[PDB]
């Protein structure tokens, strides 16, 4: 697939639509999320496209290379580590990410996995506690969706 | 990927959870759907895992081999043609299908595509008209979900 899409939903007001496109040798991620508190929010690809228990069943961050959590610019990071999206005072975060580890086909494919946006900022694996090395202390999952093949 | 899952949701009362497991050259489909009118309902994999416009954005039945619509036992069928599920008096349909044409990997993989349950029975392409060999005359889309990788 060369295009994918994800519709985020949760128990609260946060929602959004995320688009993915394979361009060149990389993946361009665009879209928007609304209903967020002003500021930074962790944003990652989780391993399972399973919404049977809400966002909890998506599992941990997608991590096929078995590394510790980091920011998108770090060598030591999970494949799903897309950092933070930033919401303005109106609650809107415009997503604009280009990422070198995710893909839409093959081993690194995120098709069928889940995008999650979190309650708190991702500390990029630099918080200094064990949780930082797993999730960046991004906290609860406000909304998520399964990543599907788009036309 | 040897397991997948799909949670069906719509704008009405129908909902359900569908599980998929690869066994040999088949996929075993299980689960249940509730809130249905008693009787048969068409059940297919549609091409796109795009929920930006409810179930309409899922597109047509998944058909990489460019064939006409048929029942799951027919040679001439769409890869996404899984026939009918049957709801009891209480509106519950227990899913139990073993299919040789859908897959969870490779080009006829359904991961990242959409499962749809319909308003009417699928006539298995034997309705006697042209709509029969496109959709089985199964009617409107009551609920759908994107098919994701499961643990
Ligand atoms: Cu996350
Ligand atoms: Cu269908
Ligand atoms: Zn991570
Ligand atoms: Zn069909």
UniProtKB/Swiss-Prot annotation, chains A, B:
Enzyme Commission no: 1.15.1.1
Location in the cell: Cytoplasm; Nucleus
Keywords (A to Z) from UniProt: Acetylation, Antioxidant, Copper, Cytoplasm, Disulfide bond, Lipoprotein, Metal-binding, Nucleus, Oxidoreductase, Palmitate, Phosphoprotein, Zinc
N6-acetyllysine: modified positions: 120, 134
Reactions catalysed: 2 superoxide + 2 H(+) = H2O2 + O2
Residue pairs linked by disulfide bridges in the UniProt entry: 55-144
Residues that hold Zn(2+) according to the record: 61, 69, 78, 81
This protein's GO CC annotations: cytoplasm; cytoplasmic vesicle; cytosol; dendrite cytoplasm; mitochondrion; neuronal cell body; nucleus; peroxisome
Record PTM text: Palmitoylation helps nuclear targeting and decreases catalytic activity. Succinylation, adjacent to copper catalytic site, probably inhibits activity. Desuccinylation by SIRT5 enhances activity.
Signal peptide extent: none
Quaternary structure, from the entry: Homodimer; non-disulfide-linked. Heterodimer with SOD1. The heterodimer CCS:SOD1 interacts with SLC31A1; this heterotrimer is Cu(1+)-mediated and its maintenance is regulated through SOD1 activation.
Annotated family: Belongs to the Cu-Zn superoxide dismutase family.
Protein name as catalogued: Superoxide dismutase [Cu-Zn]
């Amino acid at each position: 697939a060369t295009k994918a899409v994800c519709v985020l939903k949760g128990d609260g007001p946060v929602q959004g639509t995320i688009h993915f496109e394979a361009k060149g040798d990389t993946v361009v991620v665009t879209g928007s999320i609304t209903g967020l508190t002003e500021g930074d929010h962790g944003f990652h690809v989780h391993q399972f496209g399973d919404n049977t228990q809400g966002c909890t069943s998506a599992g941990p961050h997608f991590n096929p290379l078995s590394k510790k959590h980091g920011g998108p610019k770090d060598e030591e990071r999970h494949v799903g580590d897309l950092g933070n999206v930033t919401a303005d005072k109106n609650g809107v975060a415009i997503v604009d990410i280009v990422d070198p580890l995710i893909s839409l086909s093959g081993e690194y494919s995120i098709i069928g996995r889940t995008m999650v946006v979190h309650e708190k900022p991702d500390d990029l694996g630099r918080g200094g506690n064990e949780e930082s090395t797993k999730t960046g202390n991004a906290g609860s999952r406000l909304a998520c969706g399964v990543i599907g093949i788009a036309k």
